[PDB]
Amino acid sequence: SEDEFLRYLWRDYLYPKQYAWVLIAAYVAVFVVALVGNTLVCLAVWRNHHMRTVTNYFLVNLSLADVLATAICLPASLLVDITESWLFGHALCKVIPYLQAVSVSVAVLTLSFIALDRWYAICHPLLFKSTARRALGSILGIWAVSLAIMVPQAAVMECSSVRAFSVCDERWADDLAPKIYHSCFFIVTYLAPLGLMAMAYFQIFRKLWEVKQMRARRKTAKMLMVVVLVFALCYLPISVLNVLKRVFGMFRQASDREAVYAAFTFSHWLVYANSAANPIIYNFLSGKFREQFKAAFSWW
Numbered sequence: 001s002e003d004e005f006l007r008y009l010w011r012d013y014l015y016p017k018q019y020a021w022v023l024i025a026a027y028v029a030v031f032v033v034a035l036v037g038n039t040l041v042c043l044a045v046w047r048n049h050h051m052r053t054v055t056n057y058f059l060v061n062l063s064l065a066d067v068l069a070t071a072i073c074l075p076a077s078l079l080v081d082i083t084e085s086w087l088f089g090h091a092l093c094k095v096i097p098y099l100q101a102v103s104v105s106v107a108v109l110t111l112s113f114i115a116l117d118r119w120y121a122i123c124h125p126l127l128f129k130s131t132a133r134r135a136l137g138s139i140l141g142i143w144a145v146s147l148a149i150m151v152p153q154a155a156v157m158e159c160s161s162v163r164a165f166s167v168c169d170e171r172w173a174d175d176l177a178p179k180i181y182h183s184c185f186f187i188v189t190y191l192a193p194l195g196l197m198a199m200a201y202f203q204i205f206r207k208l209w210e211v212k213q214m215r216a217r218r219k220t221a222k223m224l225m226v227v228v229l230v231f232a233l234c235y236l237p238i239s240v241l242n243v244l245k246r247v248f249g250m251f252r253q254a255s256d257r258e259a260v261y262a263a264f265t266f267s268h269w270l271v272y273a274n275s276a277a278n279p280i281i282y283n284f285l286s287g288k289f290r291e292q293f294k295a296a297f298s299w300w
């Protein structure tokens with residue numbers, strides 16, 4: 001009887017709390033490291049004028065998209081990942097998924113414009129001029145586009161009541177629309193930008209691997225390839241799971257509901273883990289950012 005008791009103690013009590021601890025610790029750790037890290041990126045560029053480059057201005061914009069997701073959307077995701085219900089009412093059911101989707105769009109477009117800049121600077125020079133004022137113009141353009149293209153996402157979000165509990169999920173009048181929408185969503189936010197980026201960085205790799213500038217360029221190119229690779233890894237589970245669910249009608253079966261919950265939770269958590277990842281990447285793969293981060297830890 002002793003083995004059976006230890007098995008139910010594990011299933012009914014020890015495993016669920018171990019799960020809750022790991023889930024909350026992981027989300028809190030990501031929240032702190034992403035909030036501290038991304039503010040320090042913004043500070044590193046503001047305090048050091050030599051760091052005020054086109055790439056670094058776009059990296060500040062990537063950190064602000066990261067702060068938008070970490071401040072507003074990360075707590076909301078954590079509680080849905082815990083309760084599997086919506087506790088912020090009808091209004092925030094439209095607002096919060098919209099802001100998180102907008103932040104992904106900004107992140108993707110910011111990276112695209114970085115790749116583009118490096119590709120024209122290194123692979124095809126003298127064709128297009130790239131200045132800091134023009135980087136701000138592109139930065140504003142990225143926000144206007146991300147804010148507009150994510151309105152359809154806000155539109156389908158509905159807070160449904162059916163102890164009575166609300167759920168925040170997409171509402172679809174027909175079976176065809178979610179399939180077309182989530183196919184476009186995935187291609188535009190993930191597959192086409194990263195595919196184009198991987199090909200651009202590979203050309204930059206071929207060109208880079210005037211001597212002093214070529215040494216500087218290789219350091220930044222190595223770092224940005226890591227930022228893109230880490231972004232592609234962090235976003236792959238959520239992108240695939242969304243396509244499998246919305247385009248291939250998977251995970252509708254309730255045989256192992258918790259297995260699906262755990263897969264979607266880890267996938268939601270990884271998106272936020274990305275905001276904590278970037279300042280850590282700039283710390284190890286950038287000596288200039290590291291100096292500012294070391295200065296911040298020594299001062300505070």
Ligand SMILES: CCCCCCCC/C=C\CCCCCCCC(=O)O[C@H](COC(=O)CCCCCCCCCCCCCCC)COP(=O)(O)OC[C@@H](O)CO
Binds near residue numbers: 149152
């Ligand atoms: C980066 C490269 C891309 C470059 C392209 C750049 C293009 C930039 C141009 C214009 C952007 C302007 C924003 C348009 C705003 C979107 C307008 C909008 O809100 O759509 C509603 C209808 O659609 C809906 O719900 C359901 C949406 C239907 C989607 C079906 C698929 C059509 C294909 C479309 C796929 C796009 C996916 C974009 C992914 C990022 C109508 O709302 P309504 O007023 O009634 O009040 C809300 C009420 O419906 C709440 O229930």
Ligand SMILES: CCCCCCCC/C=C\CCCCCCCC(=O)O[C@H](COC(=O)CCCCCCCCCCCCCCC)COP(=O)(O)OC[C@@H](O)CO
Binds near residue numbers: 115116119196
């Ligand atoms: C929406 C947001 C848009 C805004 C984002 C802006 C992004 C701006 C960034 C960088 C500038 C891009 C520079 C790209 C440089 C292109 C580099 C290049 O020439 O490499 C070719 C790869 O082509 C290829 O296969 C093509 C790759 C196909 C494989 C599919 C990968 C993912 C999809 C890829 C996306 C398609 C987008 C198309 C939009 C018009 C070599 O050819 P290959 O002789 O080996 O061929 C035969 C063999 O591959 C057949 O299997």
Ligand SMILES: Cc1ncc(OC[C@@]2(c3cccc(F)c3)C[C@H]2C(=O)Nc2ccc(F)cn2)c(C)n1
Binds near residue numbers: 076081101104
């Ligand atoms: C709990 C939770 N449910 C779904 C989630 O993401 C699902 C979505 C998405 C698809 C592909 C890549 C993404 F990066 C995000 C649809 C977007 C959203 O942004 N949805 C959204 C965001 C926050 C939120 F609280 C509720 N829904 C998340 C990230 N968290």
Ligand SMILES: CCCCCCCCS[C@@H]1O[C@H](CO)[C@@H](O)[C@H](O)[C@H]1O
Binds near residue numbers: 011
């Ligand atoms: C933070 C969210 C808390 C984690 C919840 C996931 C753990 C479920 S484990 C286990 O699943 C069995 C299904 O048969 C039930 O009988 C038990 O009661 C339960 O303990």
Ligand SMILES: CCCCCCCCS[C@@H]1O[C@H](CO)[C@@H](O)[C@H](O)[C@H]1O
Binds near residue numbers: 156
């Ligand atoms: C190519 C033209 C693109 C326009 C596509 C519009 C199709 C409407 S889908 C419809 O939108 C509603 C918004 O109120 C949701 O509530 C529904 O549940 C959803 O199914």
Ligand SMILES: CCCCCCCCS[C@@H]1O[C@H](CO)[C@@H](O)[C@H](O)[C@H]1O
Binds near residue numbers: 180247248249
């Ligand atoms: C504009 C691009 C959008 C095209 C994608 C719509 C076609 C749906 S694929 C189809 O969907 C079913 C879901 O029920 C699955 O059963 C099938 O296995 C799968 O093959």
